[PDB]
Amino acid sequence: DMYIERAGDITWEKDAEVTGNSPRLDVALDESGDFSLVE
Amino acid sequence: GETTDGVYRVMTRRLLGSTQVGVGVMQEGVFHTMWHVTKGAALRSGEGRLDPYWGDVKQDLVSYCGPWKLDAAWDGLSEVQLLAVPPGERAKNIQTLPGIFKTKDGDIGAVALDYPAGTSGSPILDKCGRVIGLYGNGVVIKNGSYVSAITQGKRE
Numbered sequence: 001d002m003y004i005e006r007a008g009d010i011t012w013e014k015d016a017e018v019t020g021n022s023p024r025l026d027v028a029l030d031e032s033g034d035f036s037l038v039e
Numbered sequence: 040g041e042t043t044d045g046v047y048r049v050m051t052r053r054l055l056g057s058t059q060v061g062v063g064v065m066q067e068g069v070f071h072t073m074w075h076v077t078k079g080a081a082l083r084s085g086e087g088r089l090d091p092y093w094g095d096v097k098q099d100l101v102s103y104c105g106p107w108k109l110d111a112a113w114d115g116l117s118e119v120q121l122l123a124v125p126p127g128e129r130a131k132n133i134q135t136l137p138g139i140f141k142t143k144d145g146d147i148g149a150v151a152l153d154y155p156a157g158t159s160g161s162p163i164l165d166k167c168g169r170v171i172g173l174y175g176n177g178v179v180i181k182n183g184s185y186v187s188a189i190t191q192g193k194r195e
């Protein structure tokens with residue numbers, strides 16, 4: 001049985017940790033809502 | 040029940056201890072998460088009950104108490120922030136430039152940040168603090184890391 005707890009406000013924060021790349025990927029979306037790589 | 044706007048943890052006691060299965064966004068009295076986190080089950084907030092209102096396994100979204108409210112979109116240029124809420128760890132903003140999921144039905148923003156499965160439902164923000172989508176549905180890549188769509192619903 002699932003419950004929710006508040007974890008914070010939704011705010012943009014100036015000077016957060018800036019990380020991650022920006023990959024361009026060919027993907028398929030099936031009827032179950034699973035993405036997959038089309039190569 | 041607590042109906043204040045903000046980000047929330049989704050928890051179960053059906054396993055060992057209290058386990059975090061995902062995250063969601065309360066806005067305008069509606070709770071928003073990803074389908075794979077709740078499987079469309081009802082939710083408790085204190086003594087209050089949240090019943091599902093709208094959902095779609097293919098979009099992998101679900102709303103509680105009311106229709107989908109989040110209509111903001113990635114502009115396809117500007118950096119964004121993943122307001123990650125990992126299991127047992129404080130809310131933390133992580134700023135990134137999204138890549139692109141190319142599909143037959145069109146292009147979608149993607150964020151390449153690696154967090155436990157229980158972080159599914161964490162919101163992605165634009166510069167004005169508006170939710171442009173939820174983190175937690177995408178693909179495992181050549182490397183082995185995770186890339187998530189920026190998944191957004193339609194507002195009617």
Ligand SMILES: COc1ccc(-c2ccccc2C(=O)Nc2cnn(C)c2)cn1
Pocket residue numbers: 075154155156157158159174175176177179185187
């Ligand atoms: C199999 O290895 C893993 C481990 C973890 C993840 C993962 C990582 C970040 C955010 C969400 C997820 C996640 O679980 N998404 C998802 C979508 N649909 N279902 C059923 C689960 C994906 N793959």
